[PDB]
Amino acid sequence: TIXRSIPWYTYRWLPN
């Protein structure tokens, strides 16, 4: 579970 930007955006957090 590493959050990345490229080549796929995989960040999972949603701002409150």
């Epitope: 959050x3 930007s5 960040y11 701002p15």
Partner: antibody, heavy 123, light 108 residues
Framework: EVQLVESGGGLVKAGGSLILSCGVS????????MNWVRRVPGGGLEWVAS????????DYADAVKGRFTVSRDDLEDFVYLQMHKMRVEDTAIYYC????????????????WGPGTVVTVSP | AVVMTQSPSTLSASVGDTITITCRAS??????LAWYQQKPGKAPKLLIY???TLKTGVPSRFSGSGSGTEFTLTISGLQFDDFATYHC?????????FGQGTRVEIKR
Amino acid sequence: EVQLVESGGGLVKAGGSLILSCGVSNFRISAHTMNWVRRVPGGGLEWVASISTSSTYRDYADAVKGRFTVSRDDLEDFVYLQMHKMRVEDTAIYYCARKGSDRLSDNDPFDAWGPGTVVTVSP
Amino acid sequence: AVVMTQSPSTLSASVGDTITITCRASQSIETWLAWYQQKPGKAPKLLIYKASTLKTGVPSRFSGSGSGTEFTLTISGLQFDDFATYHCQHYAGYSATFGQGTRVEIKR
């Protein structure tokens, strides 16, 4: 007092890659969410990317998601934008901008902008 | 995916006029709205934030109002230096959305 300056703009062929940087004067970026914005030839502004404090969260416009990555270097006060698989519609003036206010809140406007750097993608 | 729509896209007016740019959002954004001025070749300048708050240094002839889905920027007594492009912006913690921009030009 506060200044921002972009470097790296240029002419790139479609499908190519280009990296931009942003430096500052008279403040530290560390406490600021830093952003990239572009003005397309039509004249309108488009939000491109945001990089929060501690580099924990990064968000991108749908048009560039999967292709662009933003990075920050707090110790030397730099922000970067990598652009890959570039397209004609990426052609624009790119600005580095900070979210800020006299007292930082959870949601401040873009109070300081760089002059911009021109990026051109040939078809 | 909030859509910000400015109106009109081009606004033709004369010096001394009083004009109104409208920005409407496709859904409620409370007062998280800012207005920017931009002249050709130059950086955007923040004029107003939180829908109606004037940034220090900005002349009182600039005025912002609105909430929810409808917002207006009014310039009272348009001056030559006010001819420029104006952008509204929905700003959130980690993203933003801009209108298409409104260019204010000399009417003829």
